[PDB]
């Protein structure tokens, strides 16, 4: 191939293993937000890993927005220490990735119609809903948004190797439809 | 207010005669009676405003890509207009810096091309100092085309092509051992390439013809 996909977003989760009050955390945390009338969770953003953590009463946290597995883990540990400091018995249970969005460009405009006619069993291209084609790869379960400018947005992964495999699989298929 | 129409009418009447003789222009002036184009009740402001506009019109007509006949006609037009005004300050012609650099070689060609009528007209219009040499054309706040095809393919161009083509034919006839066996790797040149260029230029010209031809 020759083009490696740049990760853009990584949703991971972690279990604190202790119930929390969202009022307490929200009133006593620095960059927290909590409007239960709109969503029952505390949205805590931090700058260095540049991440957004949603924290739930049950003790489960989801850290999104980090662009690396290690970086996501570090942001999760930061939020864990934050909650621990606010007076709760925070713990670090089953930190597990749940999504990894990758994005890359192939540097040539593609003909969609050819692709959708070639792989009608996979692609769901409707330009009056979403102007990109949606190729649902099956061998790795990864959804690829392909656009007329060549931008490919892979999503749904659970590890970086999966995005790499999926993009390498999808590369020649697109090479075949270079406008 | 319609002055562009009469100016274009004079330009067309002149380019149809295919003349560079200022005598034909003088006759077209006397017939179309441009001695009146300014005549009429105007106080002073409409007068010099319309004179400015007419001079600017004639000048922009003078410039490329307009035809040489049209250009000489617009030059004679500028001459007649500027030399025929009613305002005491004879409005000047707005001449740019970019357009002056080409009017220079145009005047030079007019001298070279033995068109001494237009050359003398231009030397006169410079002598009486009818030019306001501006920076950008007119002011600033806030067609008869020249085909590139003929610049690319001429009768002289195709003639030279065919001369060198027949020369190369007669020469490749001799340079080999014989005159009747061209090698397979030495027969690739098209003998109709000249004909192909003629076909392309003629199909373009007939496209333009049917473009002006209504239906």
């Amino acid at each position: 191939s020759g083009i490696v996909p740049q990760l853009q977003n990584i949703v991971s989760t972690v279990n604190l293993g202790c119930k929390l009050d969202l009022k307490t955390i929200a009133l006593r945390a620095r960059n927290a937000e909590y409007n239960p009338k709109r969503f029952a969770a505390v949205i805590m953003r931090i700058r260095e890993p540049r991440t957004t953590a949603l924290i739930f009463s049950s003790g489960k946290m989801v850290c999104t927005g980090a662009k690396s597995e290690e970086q996501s883990r570090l942001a999760a540990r930061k939020y864990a220490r934050v909650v621990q400091k606010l007076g709760f018995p925070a713990k670090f249970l089953d930190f597990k990735i749940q999504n990894m969005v990758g994005s890359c460009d192939v540097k040539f405009p593609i003909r969609l119609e050819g692709l959708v006619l070639t792989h009608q069993q996979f692609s769901s291209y409707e330009p009056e809903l979403f102007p990109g084609l949606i190729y649902r790869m099956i061998k790795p379960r990864i959804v690829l948004l392909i656009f007329v400018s060549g931008k490919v947005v892979l999503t749904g992964a659970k590890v970086r190797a999966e995005i790499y495999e999926a993009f390498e699989n999808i590369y020649p298929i697109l090479k075949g439809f270079r406008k | 207010p319609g002055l562009q129409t009469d100016c274009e009418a004079l330009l067309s009447r002149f380019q149809e005669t295919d003349s560079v003789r200022f005598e034909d222009f003088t006759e077209l002036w006397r017939n179309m009676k441009f001695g009146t184009i300014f005549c009429g009740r105007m106080r002073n402001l409409e007068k010099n405003m319309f004179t400015k506009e007419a001079l600017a019109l004639a000048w922009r007509y003078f410039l490329p890509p307009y035809t040489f006949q049209i250009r000489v006609g617009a030059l004679y037009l500028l001459y007649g207009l500027y030399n025929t005004q009613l305002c005491q300050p004879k409005q000047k012609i707005r001449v740019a810096l970019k357009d002056w650099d080409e009017v220079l070689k145009f005047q030079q060609d007019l001298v070279n091309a033995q068109h001494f009528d237009a050359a003398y007209i231009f030397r006169k219009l410079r002598l009486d100092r009818a030019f306001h040499f501006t920076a950008m054309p007119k002011l600033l706040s806030y067609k008869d085309p020249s085909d590139r095809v003929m610049k690319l393919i001429t009768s002289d161009v195709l003639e030279e092509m065919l001369n060198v083509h027949d020369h190369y034919q007669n020469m490749k006839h001799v340079i080999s051992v014989d005159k009747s066996k061209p090698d397979k790797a030495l027969s690739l040149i098209k003998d109709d390439f000249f004909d192909n260029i003629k076909n392309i230029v003629l199909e373009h010209q007939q496209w333009h013809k049917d473009r002006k031809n209504p239906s």
């Binding site: - | 706040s141 806030y142 590139r148 610049k151 690319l152 060198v164 340079i175």
Partner: protein, 69 residues
């Protein structure tokens, strides 16, 4: 008699045809410059945006602070 004449004749032919490309490519560059000028004309302030607060901001609409004068 000898290809050397072929060599020199082909050199001169290539020279003339390359001069032809030089002129033609200059014409192409001029035409593309004209096209770029036309595009920027399509992509080309009103003298209203330069009234009393002549120095308006881009992140805001307010001008500069008042002057000691």
């Amino acid at each position: 008699e000898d290809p050397e004449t072929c060599l020199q004749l082909n050199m001169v032919y290539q020279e003339v045809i390359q001069e032809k490309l030089a002129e033609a490519n200059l014409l192409l560059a001029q035409n593309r410059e004209q096209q770029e000028e036309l595009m920027r004309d399509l992509a080309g302030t009103y003298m209203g945006h330069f009234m009393k607060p002549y120095f308006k901001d881009k992140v805001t609409g307010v001008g500069p602070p008042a002057n000691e004068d």
